[PDB]
Amino acid sequence: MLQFYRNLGKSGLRVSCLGLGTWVTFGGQITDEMAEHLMTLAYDNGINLFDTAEVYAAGKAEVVLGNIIKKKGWRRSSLVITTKIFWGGKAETERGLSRKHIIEGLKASLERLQLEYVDVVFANRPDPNTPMEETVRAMTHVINQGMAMYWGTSRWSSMEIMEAYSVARQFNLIPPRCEQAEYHMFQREKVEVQLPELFHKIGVGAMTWSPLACGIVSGKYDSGIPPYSRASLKGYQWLKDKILSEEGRRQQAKLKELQAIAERLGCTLPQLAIAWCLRNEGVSSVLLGASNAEQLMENIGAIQVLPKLSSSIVHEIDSILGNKPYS
Amino acid sequence: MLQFYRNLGKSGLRVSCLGLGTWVTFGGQITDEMAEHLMTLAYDNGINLFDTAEVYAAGKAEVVLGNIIKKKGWRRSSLVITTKIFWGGKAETERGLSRKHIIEGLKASLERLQLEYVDVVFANRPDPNTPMEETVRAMTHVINQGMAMYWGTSRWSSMEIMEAYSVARQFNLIPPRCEQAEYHMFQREKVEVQLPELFHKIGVGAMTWSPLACGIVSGKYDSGIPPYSRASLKGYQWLKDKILSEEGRRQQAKLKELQAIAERLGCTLPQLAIAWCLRNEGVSSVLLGASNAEQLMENIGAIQVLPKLSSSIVHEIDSILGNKPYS
Amino acid sequence: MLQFYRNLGKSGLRVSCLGLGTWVTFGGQITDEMAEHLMTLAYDNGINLFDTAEVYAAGKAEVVLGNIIKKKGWRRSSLVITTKIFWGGKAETERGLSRKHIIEGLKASLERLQLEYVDVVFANRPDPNTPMEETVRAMTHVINQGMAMYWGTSRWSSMEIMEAYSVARQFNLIPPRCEQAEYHMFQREKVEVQLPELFHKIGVGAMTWSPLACGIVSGKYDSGIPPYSRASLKGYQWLKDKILSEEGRRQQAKLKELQAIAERLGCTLPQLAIAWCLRNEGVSSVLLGASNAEQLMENIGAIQVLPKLSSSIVHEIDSILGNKPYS
Amino acid sequence: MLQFYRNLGKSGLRVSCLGLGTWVTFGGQITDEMAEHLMTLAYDNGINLFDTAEVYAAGKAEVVLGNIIKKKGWRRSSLVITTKIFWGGKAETERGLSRKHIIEGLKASLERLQLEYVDVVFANRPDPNTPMEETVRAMTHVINQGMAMYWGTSRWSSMEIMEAYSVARQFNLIPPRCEQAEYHMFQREKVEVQLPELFHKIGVGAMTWSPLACGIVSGKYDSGIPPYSRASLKGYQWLKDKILSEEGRRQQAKLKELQAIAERLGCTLPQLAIAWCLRNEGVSSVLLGASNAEQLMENIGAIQVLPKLSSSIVHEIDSILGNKPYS
Ligand SMILES: NC(=O)C1=CN([C@@H]2O[C@H](COP(=O)(O)OP(=O)(O)OC[C@H]3O[C@@H](n4cnc5c(N)ncnc54)[C@H](OP(=O)(O)O)[C@@H]3O)[C@@H](O)[C@H]2O)C=CC1
Ligand SMILES: NC(=O)C1=CN([C@@H]2O[C@H](COP(=O)(O)OP(=O)(O)OC[C@H]3O[C@@H](n4cnc5c(N)ncnc54)[C@H](OP(=O)(O)O)[C@@H]3O)[C@@H](O)[C@H]2O)C=CC1
Ligand SMILES: NC(=O)C1=CN([C@@H]2O[C@H](COP(=O)(O)OP(=O)(O)OC[C@H]3O[C@@H](n4cnc5c(N)ncnc54)[C@H](OP(=O)(O)O)[C@@H]3O)[C@@H](O)[C@H]2O)C=CC1
Ligand SMILES: NC(=O)C1=CN([C@@H]2O[C@H](COP(=O)(O)OP(=O)(O)OC[C@H]3O[C@@H](n4cnc5c(N)ncnc54)[C@H](OP(=O)(O)O)[C@@H]3O)[C@@H](O)[C@H]2O)C=CC1
Ligand SMILES: C[C@]12C=CC(=O)C=C1CC[C@@H]1[C@@H]2C(=O)C[C@@]2(C)[C@H]1CC[C@]2(O)/C(O)=C/O
Ligand SMILES: C[C@]12C=CC(=O)C=C1CC[C@@H]1[C@@H]2C(=O)C[C@@]2(C)[C@H]1CC[C@]2(O)/C(O)=C/O
Ligand SMILES: C[C@]12C=CC(=O)C=C1CC[C@@H]1[C@@H]2C(=O)C[C@@]2(C)[C@H]1CC[C@]2(O)/C(O)=C/O
Ligand SMILES: C[C@]12C=CC(=O)C=C1CC[C@@H]1[C@@H]2C(=O)C[C@@]2(C)[C@H]1CC[C@]2(O)/C(O)=C/O
């Protein structure tokens, strides 16, 4: 009963249930050649959603993504490109959601991407220093300038998203259409309980990230930090600490149990976890991450697992995770 | 009492009571040379309205229409060019009335047409996947961007048109100005009963299409499918089936009776049918279709039949058709 | 107590109490050389307001006005250029106040003028075929597009001007700022009674035209139609008929009486009539017309007569004219 | 507890607590070489705010400021450039806050600055000849045109600023974000009593000017007009008169007393006065003025004095000045 393509929240934008992100990898961990191969595989398998941010690899991720698009020559109308704005430089005024940085930041991102506009521009996080009205007006401005088709939020509380909505309706500006939130077996509350309320009330869609908890859900950290794994990269000590933390080891324990279910279904753990993220219609799309083609092809294979996620399998997983949120 | 030129609904746009469409013919069934001749004949006879769509001949119709305009060099201000948006490609995001496709679609159409803007951009059909607000805001955006002067609907129910109006008035956007609907002796309800209500309530005008039911009303299918008739073209099996269907044969029977009236008036059947479509002021313009110059000149001749359409002749036609709608 | 410069109605635009028009003369009756001399004289004497229209000499007036500006090289910021839109071609859609013609017409005028924008764009007359909302939205659009700084009306009734205002306030569009109306000793009602109401109620200013009734007030038609006078030009039979009409001869009779007052004041009749037009603050500026430098210099001299227009002189003139409107 | 960077009023724009102005100096009193050195020193010390005006040195100040930016090549996103509009030429229409001059003036300023936009455009003073609605709409227009990020007022009464706010909320336009007001030990009322009310009520910020009262607070006029001091420059007789006026001599007397406190703190008088201006959070930034590098470096040193401004020191200063406003 899976619909590979679905509307992003209550908007007319149709996105593939799986998208491909560029955090850590593009312009950073992987070569541009590998990046080109991964994007081609995604596109060829129906994926039309690609996410990035001005902050990724100090702008390099956008340059690489833009180069691939130009090199491959795919029709712009067949792509859904999203980018996030917030961290755009070391200067005081090069960060935040002020009208100045939203305009300067997106303009710079578009230049790096070699694109006239992105399909969705997201505030990468909330800005306690900028009044909602200014941010909503600025987002509306860039959309009206043809620099973006839609705008959205990321890591905003449901109250903040509703505040953006309130401002849009009070001053007749454009309402946000999507919230890019973390979602995986170890982070469920927001996406499973709060976001559905926003969907029904104001049509905001949910585009989720880190479906494997940065690779942790793959289960390859079962016995330490594998050489060259994300957690071993420079600038990712924070990920390593989480993995080696007491709770991180408790997560691995549960993964072992989940691993059993995977085998019982005939799929890998990552495939189980990703398919799990797409089990409810509440999620419009899950953004994937991959450092090589084997991972990406494996991940995309999650779609075949979906039909096997019976209410029985779901309850089993909840029993193991023991973190089913309260409705 | 006929006014060759009239306002399109309650707008300041003046259109000829007859327009020339490009479906099937331009960039497809006929040569560009024939297309040039037909458009010249139309223009020289006072017709200022020419309709097309991004979907016609996969974009070729717009290219041909644009070439003729450029070659003939007619003043842009003396022309009323309309195009329809909805089917713009095979990719998921290349169809519909989302802000993304409305903007990308019209931009591409304008490029093919070699025009800076169209006079009216129509949604080719309703989009159940896009909220009215998004569509109305997008139409408003392209008008404000100078890509179109006005926008309209096509094949929308009167309720959907009123919904577009509701959205425009609630958010202070631009209301639709015209509905391009099917109208001929065998399809009367919507145009004769519903559209007049929209005209009086919200000033929406009626621009009708397929006045000869794709050629069926010409009566040339009286004894089968004539070689090279539209119904015999590739990709038009649907038309042939309708003609050969039980109801299609019942239509021909009535045509024979109508044919009698035509002769009694001194005009052809097509001329009778077209003049019939223009008998009421409710219709702003009737879009013609033609594969050769004889047909077009014949069709334009319908204007001379108008004065002969007495209340008596109209009642006779209703008696024959037996499908006069209930008011 | 005369202020040579004043605000145009309740707007921040400062115009000279005298302006120079281009009807009949520019690109038509006079040579471009004479036109250049007249504009230079005006500008050098403090006049910053120059009026034209897309219809004058089929566009030639705008070309000449634009050439002079470019040749003389005056700063654009030191000029107030106004043009009027309505009659822009022979095609059906090349006339009126529809969104299509307002945009196409002003764009064409700007091209002829070699200017990026006019200070004020006026509807040359009312358009019974275009809803007020469409016209007001179109005027607002060109102002927002930077093609004009302000918009106004011409030959509109006070009710129609208030209707434009109603539409602007209901849909949050831009209100009109000036009405260009006929004003001279033989046409007083509208400017003396109605326009002041609009000034106080909605801040609309009054820019008047034909201060000499096309030359009639000069008194040179006292004994027939002087060779080469405007009334003798081709396409101006209408003016000649008015002059030779019964009422036209009755006007000359009164002019003779006025002539006496002029001599008593030490000024010419035209100077008396023009100064008369500027006697009340209700008029922001009077648009002058001239076919040679003697006339223009004479007319500008009207400013010196102003101080001599005592309440006694005004009553005398009213007694002679016998057409003082009722308040 | 000082935060070097702070929000400009309730906006997301972050400005350094100290800014560098260009009045008198740039393109005028100092060489472009000196101007370059001063701006570099400011920038290198964290200052991101630079103020100018179309009227300064008849446009030359903007040319010099723009040249330095281009020569130094600093990222535009790391700078906050503000300019003021009002006096833009000798022609009648080249001054004021009409839509015409706001657009023409800022366009010309941007051209001189070699910039696409300024961060904040200020009305240099109030315009009694232009209705608030026109000014607010024009400011909104240039912001929407991408010529400025924000707009503000200068030398406007708190009532006039609230009027601009009223207009913005009534017609859904953009509200002003900052008031550039005079602030120093001899001019305190407005900034200390009125502006805080506007901050809390409508989020307007306070950017202050002439922190040394044009150099008077430096105390170098203790015994006359020093050669080459601002007060001795051509076109600044007004400053000299103030200094030599009875009240001006009374100010010097108090400066002598303040001088004592400075020495007691281990700082210069200018440093004491500038730090004094930044003692309250009500002031977002203080615009500095300097004719040489010694002054600028001295002034910037005011930041170190801040921590020494105890409630005791403040009361002492108030006792000396004797002009503490009433709350
Ligand atoms: N809005 C926001 O704040 C955020 C947005 N995002 C978006 O979401 C996207 C995806 O997030 P991301 O955290 O990368 O996703 P995941 O949590 O799915 O982690 C993907 C990473 O895990 C490893 N991995 C992936 N598949 C496998 C596999 N089959 N077997 C073993 N290891 C595997 C790889 O790392 P390695 O091989 O190096 O171990 C890969 O880079 C981003 O690119 C970005 O676009 C992400 C975070 C936040
Ligand atoms: N908004 C919408 O969804 C729609 C819009 N339209 C618009 O309306 C226009 C007209 O529609 P269309 O269906 O073509 O019109 P008609 O129903 O009038 O059919 C015209 C066709 O019938 C035949 N024909 C025309 N005149 C004669 C004649 N005198 N004698 C014999 N056969 C004749 C020709 O086909 P042949 O010679 O090949 O038999 C011609 O191509 C289109 O081009 C398009 O612009 C049309 C449909 C839908
Ligand atoms: N909005 C609208 O509908 C209208 C706008 N206007 C505007 O107003 C402007 C002025 O109107 P216009 O009718 O020309 O003005 P006037 O009524 O003042 O007539 C001017 C004409 O009268 C003659 N004349 C002028 N001064 C003298 C003089 N001192 N002695 C003798 N004859 C003299 C000249 O014609 P000649 O030498 O050929 O006799 C000249 O062309 C126009 O150019 C136009 O810009 C005008 C009409 C309508
Ligand atoms: N919005 C508005 O209407 C106004 C805005 N402003 C803005 O504010 C900025 C600053 O104003 P400004 O009046 O110049 O500032 P100040 O009152 O601080 O005066 C600065 C001037 O005083 C002298 N000076 C500065 N530091 C010292 C020192 N340490 N020792 C001795 N003399 C010193 C210099 O003049 P010299 O060496 O020649 O004596 C210098 O040019 C302007 O450049 C402008 O951007 C200013 C006024 C009005
Ligand atoms: C390093 C960073 C950037 C600068 C900074 O001062 C602080 C942080 C911490 C949080 C980071 C952020 C990013 O670079 C963007 C991140 C990594 C984010 C957490 C999620 C994120 O929002 C994202 O989008 C991943 O895809
Ligand atoms: C083939 C088509 C295009 C793609 C598609 O998936 C389905 C259809 C079916 C209905 C078609 C449509 C068109 O191409 C446009 C048409 C033909 C329309 C019916 C009326 C129409 O709207 C029109 O405009 C004729 O002029
Ligand atoms: C000839 C004309 C243009 C075409 C037309 O079909 C009818 C008329 C009659 C009224 C004319 C008009 C103009 O050309 C503009 C005029 C002359 C106007 C009367 C006042 C006017 O509005 C004006 O502006 C003079 O300055
Ligand atoms: C000379 C000037 C410009 C022209 C004019 O007709 C009158 C004045 C007097 C007041 C002046 C003004 C300026 O030039 C700008 C000034 C100097 C202003 C006072 C403060 C000011 O607003 C400012 O900004 C200094 O930085």
GROMACS .gro file of C-alpha atoms in nm, chain D residues 15-109:
model
   95
  996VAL     CA    1   2.571   4.548   1.533
  997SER     CA    2   2.891   4.631   1.719
  998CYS     CA    3   2.827   4.860   2.019
  999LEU     CA    4   3.050   5.110   1.840
 1000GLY     CA    5   3.015   5.218   1.480
 1001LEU     CA    6   3.212   5.456   1.260
 1002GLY     CA    7   3.046   5.749   1.087
 1003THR     CA    8   3.158   5.949   0.785
 1004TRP     CA    9   3.012   6.295   0.847
 1005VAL     CA   10   3.255   6.584   0.783
 1006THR     CA   11   3.556   6.353   0.748
 1007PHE     CA   12   3.510   6.117   0.451
 1008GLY     CA   13   3.547   6.281   0.112
 1009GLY     CA   14   3.590   6.606   0.303
 1010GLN     CA   15   3.809   6.692   0.603
 1011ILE     CA   16   4.038   6.388   0.576
 1012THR     CA   17   4.216   6.224   0.282
 1013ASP     CA   18   4.092   5.896   0.133
 1014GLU     CA   19   4.414   5.741   0.260
 1015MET     CA   20   4.333   5.844   0.616
 1016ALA     CA   21   3.973   5.728   0.566
 1017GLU     CA   22   4.099   5.388   0.456
 1018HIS     CA   23   4.321   5.359   0.763
 1019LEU     CA   24   4.040   5.457   1.001
 1020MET     CA   25   3.793   5.209   0.852
 1021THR     CA   26   4.053   4.932   0.859
 1022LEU     CA   27   4.126   5.002   1.226
 1023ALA     CA   28   3.753   4.995   1.303
 1024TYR     CA   29   3.689   4.673   1.111
 1025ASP     CA   30   3.997   4.504   1.257
 1026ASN     CA   31   3.874   4.590   1.605
 1027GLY     CA   32   3.536   4.425   1.552
 1028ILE     CA   33   3.331   4.723   1.432
 1029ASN     CA   34   3.085   4.616   1.161
 1030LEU     CA   35   2.869   4.931   1.150
 1031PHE     CA   36   2.947   5.222   0.917
 1032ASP     CA   37   2.713   5.516   0.865
 1033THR     CA   38   2.688   5.773   0.588
 1034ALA     CA   39   2.438   5.991   0.400
 1035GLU     CA   40   2.368   6.113   0.048
 1036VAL     CA   41   2.425   6.469   0.176
 1037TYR     CA   42   2.775   6.419   0.326
 1038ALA     CA   43   3.027   6.608   0.114
 1039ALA     CA   44   2.770   6.619  -0.164
 1040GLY     CA   45   2.794   6.244  -0.217
 1041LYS     CA   46   3.172   6.211  -0.185
 1042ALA     CA   47   3.157   6.041   0.154
 1043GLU     CA   48   2.963   5.750   0.002
 1044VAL     CA   49   3.210   5.726  -0.287
 1045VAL     CA   50   3.505   5.704  -0.044
 1046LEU     CA   51   3.331   5.455   0.184
 1047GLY     CA   52   3.244   5.243  -0.118
 1048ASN     CA   53   3.598   5.257  -0.255
 1049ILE     CA   54   3.749   5.137   0.072
 1050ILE     CA   55   3.507   4.843   0.092
 1051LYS     CA   56   3.591   4.744  -0.266
 1052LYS     CA   57   3.966   4.793  -0.218
 1053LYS     CA   58   3.983   4.605   0.113
 1054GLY     CA   59   3.754   4.338  -0.032
 1055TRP     CA   60   3.577   4.258   0.296
 1056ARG     CA   61   3.279   4.023   0.263
 1057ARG     CA   62   2.958   4.226   0.220
 1058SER     CA   63   2.783   3.986   0.458
 1059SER     CA   64   3.025   4.086   0.735
 1060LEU     CA   65   2.931   4.454   0.707
 1061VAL     CA   66   2.639   4.668   0.822
 1062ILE     CA   67   2.625   4.974   0.598
 1063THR     CA   68   2.369   5.246   0.665
 1064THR     CA   69   2.293   5.564   0.475
 1065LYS     CA   70   2.049   5.849   0.523
 1066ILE     CA   71   1.818   6.009   0.270
 1067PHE     CA   72   1.673   6.362   0.252
 1068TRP     CA   73   1.909   6.617   0.097
 1069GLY     CA   74   1.996   6.491  -0.249
 1070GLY     CA   75   2.028   6.794  -0.474
 1071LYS     CA   76   1.940   7.155  -0.544
 1072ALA     CA   77   1.626   7.084  -0.746
 1073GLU     CA   78   1.290   7.105  -0.567
 1074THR     CA   79   1.224   6.733  -0.613
 1075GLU     CA   80   1.573   6.627  -0.501
 1076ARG     CA   81   1.496   6.663  -0.131
 1077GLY     CA   82   1.247   6.521   0.116
 1078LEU     CA   83   1.087   6.184   0.187
 1079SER     CA   84   0.853   6.160  -0.112
 1080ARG     CA   85   0.839   5.825  -0.289
 1081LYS     CA   86   1.021   5.991  -0.580
 1082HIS     CA   87   1.322   6.109  -0.380
 1083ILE     CA   88   1.343   5.805  -0.153
 1084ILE     CA   89   1.374   5.584  -0.460
 1085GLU     CA   90   1.589   5.822  -0.665
 1086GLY     CA   91   1.801   5.916  -0.364
 1087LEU     CA   92   1.878   5.563  -0.245
 1088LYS     CA   93   1.942   5.448  -0.602
 1089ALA     CA   94   2.199   5.726  -0.644
 1090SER     CA   95   2.356   5.653  -0.304
   0.00000   0.00000   0.00000
